[model samples]
Each structure stands twice: as C-alpha cells, then as structure tokens.
Target: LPRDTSRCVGYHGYCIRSKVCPKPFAAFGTCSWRQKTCCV
Candidate 1:
C-alpha cells in the first residue's frame, strides 16, 4: 500500500496543514483523509 500511505512524488514528503508547512519546503498534494497539504 505504498500509494495508500502518506507520501508525495518527487518530494517524498508528509501531509500537513497548508500554513503549518514552513519555508524551504513546498506544497504538493493533499492528504487522502482530511485534504491536508503535502509539504516537501
């Protein structure tokens, strides 16, 4: 279930709130559950 688990392509990052995502990192995809932002 690699795709099912929390992960984003290229970035290999985690899903978090949009604003919670800090600098250096970037927004990619939304979490499957709550639609949270994926930061890498």
Candidate 2:
C-alpha cells in the first residue's frame, strides 16, 4: 500500500512542556512531530 512517509518524519522522543523548543527544550529533553513546541 502507498504510504505517508511523512507520518513520522519529524520526531525525536518524549519531552515535557516547554515555553520554547530546540535550543532551550532539546537541551534538557526532546519533543516530537506531534508537538512543535519547546519541552523539557
């Protein structure tokens, strides 16, 4: 069956809610494709 490759393209791991992402959040924990916000 044809697939939605983009389904899980953008993701990392579990993370807590963060004010900002990437630098600030990723530094402590990580976010997932489901959430584009900062998490720690």
Candidate 3:
C-alpha cells in the first residue's frame, strides 16, 4: 500500500480529493495533510 493508504476497519482505503466519498465507499483516514478522505 502507498503511504497515504489506510485501513478501513477490515478493508484497505486510499485517499481521494473528492468532497464526498462515492457509493459503497466509507471514510477511514486522511491525506494531503489531512485535507482529503481515505475512502474504502
């Protein structure tokens, strides 16, 4: 996984620049200095 990748409960998540996560996705962590959401 990349440095910005995060563990979303029991899944793997990656940071995104969108204001909201798309369907089937959930927030797990942050990126870009805590400015983005790590969606899983």
lDDT of 1 by residue, 1-40 (tens): 2352255644576666554677666766565455566677
Best candidate per TM-score, number? Answer: 3
Candidate 3 clashing pairs, residues 3+ apart or interchain? none
Tens-digit lDDT string for candidate 3 (1-40): 4345444423655568775888677766665456777678
Query: Native-vs-model 2 lDDT?
Result: 0.36
Which pairs of residues collide in model 1? none
C-alpha lDDT score of every prediction, in listed order: 0.58, 0.36, 0.62
Candidate 1 backbone clash number: 0
Question: Each prediction's TM-score against the native?
Answer: 0.47, 0.18, 0.50
Q: Candidate 3: worst 10 consecutive residues by lDDT?
A: 1-10
Which lDDT tens digits does candidate 2 get at residues 1-40? 1122133233443343453545533532223433433233
**lDDT of candidate 3?**
0.62
Angstrom error of the Cα, residue 13, model 3: value is 3.2
